[PDB]
């Protein structure tokens, strides 16, 4: 209607482009977007291995589910200017080393790597863009932490800690201290897993947390959540 032959053919080309865009969007909607975070090179590599310079794309499939895990390491800038790009991710995978409770960051004087991880977790968890985004917290290097906690007590890291110098109690205390940074407990869930250097069930934990998040999302659609 009031179109030339070239106009009609351009409209047909636009409709083909729309079709391919719809197919690409439907392909990308079934993918799981995960934001990988952590304080420096602490346990991100190990995890990436268990699952498989700007942003790093890690692709892996588990139980007929494709995962898109994004590493924002070596993006040394203001986080708030690009952290809204990951507002629609399924979950945040936060990697924390357990063995750096007594190490120093060496960038600031009298700075703890553990407390830097706590501050980064407090900023990420209570961020305005991640109000309803669940966090899969990974506590890296449990065996190294277990064998070094005998030599170095955790009280040098947490002065208010008064428990025994055992792996289980101090690990639970560290997990509780990280979960206490969540001020939005009524609207988001934090999944904590303790991972060794060579631990096979890391993917299954990510799949279970992502499945919970997907169930949450599914309910909203059925107007049931």
């Amino acid at each position: 209607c009031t179109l030339s032959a070239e106009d009609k053919a351009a409209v047909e080309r636009s409709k083909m482009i729309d079709r391919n865009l719809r197919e690409d969007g439907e392909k990308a909607a079934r993918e799981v977007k995960l934001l990988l975070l952590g304080a420096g090179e602490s346990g991100k590599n190990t995890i990436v291995k268990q699952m498989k310079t700007g942003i790093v794309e890690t692709h892996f499939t588990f139980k007929d589910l494709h995962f898109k895990m994004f590493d924002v390491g070596a993006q040394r800038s203001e986080r708030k200017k690009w952290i809204h790009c990951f507002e629609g991710v399924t979950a945040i995978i936060f990697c924390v080393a357990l063995s750096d409770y007594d190490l120093v960051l060496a960038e600031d004087e009298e700075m703890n790597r553990m407390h830097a991880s706590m501050k980064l977790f407090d900023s990420i968890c209570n961020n305005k863009w991640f109000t309803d985004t669940s966090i899969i917290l990974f506590l890296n290097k449990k065996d190294l932490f277990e064998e070094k906690i005998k030599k170095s007590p955790l009280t040098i890291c947490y002065p208010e800690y008064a428990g025994s110098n055992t792996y289980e109690e101090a690990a639970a205390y560290i997990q509780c201290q990280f979960e206490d940074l969540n001020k939005r407990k009524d609207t988001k869930e934090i999944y904590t897993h303790f991972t060794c250097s060579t631990d096979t069930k890391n993917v299954q934990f990510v799949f279970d947390a992502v499945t919970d998040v997907i169930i949450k999302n599914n309910l909203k659609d059925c107007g049931l959540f």
Binding site: E189, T211, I215, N218, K220, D221, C222, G223, L224
Partner: protein, 281 residues
């Protein structure tokens, strides 16, 4: 062809139907408005809930005439063809409402128990193809009501009824029993599986929103059984003792009263499906 004089019915049916129509038309129309304008993007599930709202609404539109029939001491003076259209409409909208309740239950079962399944990936166009195929199968299985004369004339009192107290109507009684027991089994299975699954996830179960969803999944099943079991039971009791119960006043009154609980379902449907939704605008 008989002459029942259940004055009782003329005092309980007229009001029940007025209340059901007034509340259900409002609720279903508001739900349809929310679905059609406010909700900007639809997903296969919104297509099923919208079709359930339609069936429920259409059935509330068919109530006004049934009320006149009941106000005139059960005298149908709108003709013969209008009688077959009213009976057809009511039956089809009760069948479609049941079918879309079962569809919604199955969709929730697949969304909760098989989150990563292909059924959940279909598009709203495939959803619109199933809802139209289901509507077509509903209309085909209820057309018999348009191929017979339902008007019984006695003492200048015409009675337009499909559940005849004379004897078993046949397919109407069969369809009446299946349209409950079959979806009943599907809904019970889906509800039990959904709740059970939800519980296993202890991190998710602890949320208040998860507890509310688990409660409403059981609420919807309770309503269906409490609204559709009385009439099915009454009809079964009549069928079994057809000889003695033939044209029985008490059985007729029980059947007519219990048949209004199905209309009550289509009036509470928008309450337990749309207004109870914490996310539907």
């Amino acid at each position: 062809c008989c002459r029942i004089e259940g004055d009782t019915i003329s005092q309980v049916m007229p009001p029940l139907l007025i209340v059901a129509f007034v509340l259900g038309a409002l609720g279903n129309g508001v739900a349809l408005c929310g679905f059609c304008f406010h909700m900007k993007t639809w997903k296969p599930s919104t297509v099923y809930l919208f079709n359930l709202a339609v069936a429920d609404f259409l059935l509330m539109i068919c109530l006004p005439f049934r009320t006149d029939y009941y106000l005139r001491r059960r005298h149908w003076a709108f003709g013969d063809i209008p009688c077959r259209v009213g009976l057809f409409t009511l039956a089809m909208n009760r069948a479609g409402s049941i079918v879309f309740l079962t569809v919604v239950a199955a969709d929730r079962y697949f969304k909760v128990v098989h989150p990563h399944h292909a059924v959940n990936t279909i598009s709203t166009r495939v959803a619109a193809g199933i809802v139209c195929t289901l509507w077509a199968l509903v209309i085909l299985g209820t057309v018999y009501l348009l191929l017979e004369n339902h008007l019984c004339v006695q003492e200048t009192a015409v009675s337009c009824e499909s559940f005849i107290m004379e004897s078993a109507n046949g397919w109407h009684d069969i369809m009446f029993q299946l349209e409950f027991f079959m979806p009943l089994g599907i809904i019970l299975f889906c509800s039990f599986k959904i709740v059970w699954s939800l519980r296993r996830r202890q991190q998710l179960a602890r949320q208040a929103r998860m507890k509310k969803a688990t409660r409403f999944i059981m609420v919807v099943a309770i309503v269906f059984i409490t609204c559709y079991l009385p009439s099915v039971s009454a009809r079964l009791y009549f069928l079994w003792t057809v000889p003695s119960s033939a044209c029985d006043p008490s059985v007729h009154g029980a059947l007519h009263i219990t048949l209004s609980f199905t209309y009550m379902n289509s009036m509470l449907d928008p309450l337990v499906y749309y207004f109870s939704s914490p996310s539907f605008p």
